[PDB]
Nucleic acid binder design. Structure first.
Length: 78
DNA sequence: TTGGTTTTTCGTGCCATAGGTTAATGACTTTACAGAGGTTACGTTTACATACATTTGTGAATGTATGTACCATGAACGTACCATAATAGAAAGA
């Protein structure tokens, strides 16, 4: 189920916008070693840090839809 | 008396005078594409107040730390079932 969840999250990040995928990977430590903080993401990508939170809120609003997470609703019990 | 060349009408074929539907480019006109201009509702960038965390001192839990000065003089301090046959070892008589 972990190996299937990896491919499922890879397909979800590939189905969305590529820059959204890079933010969601380098934010929580997906496909990286360390999880970068908000100041480190601000030093890497762009100075504005409130727009990063707006991007995160927009990504959560796009990922609350059941049609894009119907294969992930079965993984909710784990 | 019978076959075949000759000749003239007559409906049919060729030529000419009339008169009408319908090809031409166009001129259409209608639909489609191309031009700017005012308005909407976002998306990114910026400052500011308050919060969980994380960084410090301070009161209690244990823990090794060295000694106690009538006389204490050898034992296993209770273990245990005793199968079977290849290969060497330390001696004993040949």
């Amino acid at each position: 189920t972990t190996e299937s969840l990896r491919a499922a999250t890879h397909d979800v990040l590939a189905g969305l916008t590529a820059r959204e995928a890079k933010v969601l990977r380098m934010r929580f430590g997906i496909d990286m070693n360390t999880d970068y903080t908000l100041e480190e993401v601000g030093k890497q990508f762009d100075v504005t840090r409130e727009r990063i939170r707006q991007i995160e809120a927009k990504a959560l609003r796009k990922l609350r839809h059941p049609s894009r997470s119907e294969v992930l609703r079965s993984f909710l019990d784990d």
